[PDB]
Amino acid sequence: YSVAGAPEALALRAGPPASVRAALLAARRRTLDLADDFRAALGDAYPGIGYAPELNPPLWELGHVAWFQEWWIGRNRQRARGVACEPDHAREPSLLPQADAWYDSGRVAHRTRWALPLPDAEATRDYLERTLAQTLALLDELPPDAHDDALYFFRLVALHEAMHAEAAAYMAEGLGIALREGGVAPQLAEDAELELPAQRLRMGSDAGTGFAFDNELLSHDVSIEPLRIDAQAVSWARFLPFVEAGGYEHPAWWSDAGRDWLARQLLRHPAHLRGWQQRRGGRWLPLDPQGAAVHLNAHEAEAWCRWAGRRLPTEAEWECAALTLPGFAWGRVWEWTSSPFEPYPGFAPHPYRDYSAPWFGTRRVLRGACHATSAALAHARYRNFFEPHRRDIFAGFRSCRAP
Ligand SMILES: C[N+](C)(C)[C@@H](Cc1cnc[nH]1)C(=O)O
Ligand SMILES: [Fe+3]
C-alpha cells in the first residue's frame, strides 16, 4: 500500500510531540484565518446568521473549538491513558465558568446556540489563545519517544479543530461569505478509467500505525472483486449531460428515497447553480466544466450512475483503489460511496464516545477529502459520514463498473 495521505497527515497520526505541536499551530492559524473571513462579512455580530440545522453561529464554533481542546487536554486528568481514558472522570474547572453549558456539543441544544450570552469576539479569541498556551505547555513536557497513548488527546484535538475549519468553509459557502483560501480547477479534467484487480484488502487502521479514529477499527481483511474505476471524481463536464438528458425529470433513475427527495425540490438541477453560473463566496460566476462536480447528495450521485450504466464504489473498493493505483487522484471533493456508516467488526467507541456511535445507521460514508480539508486530516482510511441528502458539504463522487 501507498502512503494514506500527505506528510502532515502521517506526522499528526504517528509523529513525535514536535509534529503534533506544529499541527496544533497550523490548525489554529487556519481557524483564525477563517474567523477573519467571517469577521469581514459579519463584523463580529452574534449570532450573525439566521438559524438552520446545518449551521452554527461562527462565534459559537470558535468557543467550541477552545472548549473541546481544554476538555480533552488541560482539564483531562487521564491524558496519558489515551483510548483507555474514562471519559466522564472528574475535571477541574474551565477558564470560563459557563463553558460547559455553552460549548459542549453533546449538552447544548442546537437552537439554543443562537441565544446564549457568549463572550464577544475578542474575549472568544482570548479563550482560544489561553487554552492553546495551556495545551502547548503540557505537550512540551512529553519526551521525543512519547507513546501513542501519551499523544492520543493532542492528536484528537488537532484533528477535531481541522474538522471544524472545513465546516466553517462549507457554512461560509452556504451563507455567501467569501474566503481568502480556495481550490483551483484543473485546466483539463481527467476522464480516464483504471483497472482494479481482484485482491484482498486489509481495511481500516492497524494496531500501532499511530492514531486511529474509532470507526477505523478493527482492521480486517475483505475481498475486492475486479472492477474498473474512474481515475478522478466526476467533473461538471461529465455530470451535466445527465441534467441535459432530463435526469432530474426521469424518476426511474432514482431510488425511492431519491424520488421522495427529488419530489420536494423547487429547482430540478444541482445546488448553487442557475450553460450555468455557480454561486461561490456569495458571487454568481460562470461554472467551470473542468471542476469536480460538487454540492451533490448521494441521491444525485446514484441517479447519475444509473443513467451512465455505472455505480458508486463501496468504501472498501475506494480504499483499495486509493492505496494501490498510482493514477487514482483524490482530494478535490468528498466522494459518496454506496456504504452505510456502520461499525467495522470489533468497533469500540473511543473516549469522545459521541464521535461515531450515535451516527451509525443514518449516515452514508464518504471517502477522500475536499479542497477545504486540512492536509493533516485528509487520509485514505478516514471515514466521513453525513446523511445522504446533504448538499451543503463539499461532496461529489466517482463511479465504477464491472471489468
Ligand atoms: C466527521 N464529521 C465531519 C461528520 C463530524 C466532525 C465533528 C466535529 N466535532 C465533532 N464531530 C461532524 O460534522 O459532526
Ligand atoms: Fe466538535
Side-chain angles (χ1 to χ4, degrees):
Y1 298 136
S2 71
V3 300
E8 297 90 327
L10 299 192
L12 183 46
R13 287 165 179 74
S19 296
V20 186
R21 186 182 224 291
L24 288 161
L25 289 168
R28 184 54 45 86
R29 177 178 112 127
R30 185 174 184 214
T31 295
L32 293 176
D33 286 344
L34 289 160
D36 286 352
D37 297 323
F38 277 76
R39 171 188 271 171
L42 307 180
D44 291 336
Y46 179 74
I49 63 162
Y51 179 69
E54 304 78 20
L55 297 171
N56 286 294
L59 292 185
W60 182 85
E61 288 275 318
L62 294 183
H64 172 70
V65 162
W67 170 86
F68 186 96
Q69 191 182 279
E70 183 192 44
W71 183 257
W72 290 112
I73 304 297
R75 298 171 66 189
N76 181 356
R77 297 186 160 124
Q78 298 183 23
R79 286 184 305 277
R81 301 193 197 184
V83 296
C85 175
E86 296 180 317
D88 301 327
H89 70 267
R91 287 179 163 80
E92 55 200 266
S94 176
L95 296 174
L96 291 175
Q98 298 312 119
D100 293 337
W102 290 344
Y103 296 131
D104 180 344
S105 55
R107 184 176 297 280
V108 187
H110 191 248
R111 294 170 149 291
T112 304
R113 300 166 189 192
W114 278 252
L116 295 170
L118 295 185
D120 68 18
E122 177 191 4
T124 299
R125 287 171 179 241
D126 291 342
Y127 178 50
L128 276 164
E129 278 182 6
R130 293 168 173 150
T131 55
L132 176 62
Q134 179 191 45
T135 296
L136 293 181
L138 292 165
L139 181 53
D140 286 352
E141 304 191 38
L142 291 185
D145 58 0
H147 188 107
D148 292 332
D149 297 341
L151 281 171
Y152 177 72
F153 289 103
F154 298 96
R155 296 173 174 161
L156 180 68
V157 302
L159 292 158
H160 176 256
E161 180 164 354
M163 298 194 246
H164 281 274
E166 182 186 311
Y170 61 76
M171 292 190 282
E173 186 72 321
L175 291 164
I177 292 172
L179 308 183
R180 291 192 187 286
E181 57 168 67
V184 170
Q187 196 190 19
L188 177 71
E190 258 27 72
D191 277 354
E193 194 173 55
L194 308 176
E195 292 194 338
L196 188 64
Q199 58 195 284
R200 183 178 189 108
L201 170 72
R202 178 147 302 174
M203 183 175 200
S205 291
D206 277 332
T209 143
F211 177 98
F213 290 98
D214 54 13
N215 67 49
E216 301 165 0
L217 305 175
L218 297 171
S219 179
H220 65 286
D221 289 344
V222 303
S223 291
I224 308 294
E225 282 202 82
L227 60 78
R228 296 178 284 190
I229 189 155
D230 294 343
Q232 293 200 28
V234 171
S235 67
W236 287 119
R238 263 187 94 208
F239 186 83
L240 292 168
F242 170 68
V243 182
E244 297 162 19
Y248 289 66
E249 271 130 53
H250 196 164
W253 300 127
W254 301 77
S255 72
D256 291 347
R259 279 190 273 267
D260 284 351
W261 175 82
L262 177 64
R264 293 158 175 73
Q265 303 314 303
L266 185 40
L267 297 184
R268 292 319 189 80
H269 70 234
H272 258 183
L273 306 198
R274 78 180 175 184
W276 299 91
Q277 287 162 0
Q278 179 170 7
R279 191 175 159 280
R280 298 301 250 168
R283 294 310 184 81
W284 292 97
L285 302 181
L287 175 142
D288 181 350
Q290 308 310 314
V294 66
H295 302 298
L296 296 179
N297 73 21
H299 305 314
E300 296 172 284
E302 288 180 0
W304 184 100
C305 283
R306 292 193 200 88
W307 164 89
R310 299 180 72 81
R311 59 173 180 85
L312 296 180
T314 70
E315 66 176 321
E317 288 163 347
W318 190 101
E319 185 168 308
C320 183
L323 294 173
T324 66
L325 303 179
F328 186 100
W330 57 279
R332 294 191 167 273
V333 291
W334 292 104
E335 295 167 30
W336 295 104
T337 73
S338 64
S339 300
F341 186 54
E342 291 294 353
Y344 292 171
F347 171 78
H350 284 172
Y352 178 27
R353 294 285 182 72
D354 282 355
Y355 181 66
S356 297
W359 321 110
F360 296 140
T362 62
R363 275 57 175 164
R364 185 74 72 87
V365 175
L366 311 88
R367 296 307 203 87
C370 71
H371 69 101
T373 305
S374 174
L377 186 141
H379 189 275
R381 314 292 190 159
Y382 182 89
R383 306 176 75 202
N384 211 349
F385 46 99
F386 281 98
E387 295 162 278
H389 70 278
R390 289 286 290 261
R391 296 167 112 197
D392 49 337
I393 60 170
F394 295 115
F397 68 105
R398 79 180 68 218
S399 71
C400 66
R401 66 170 167 172

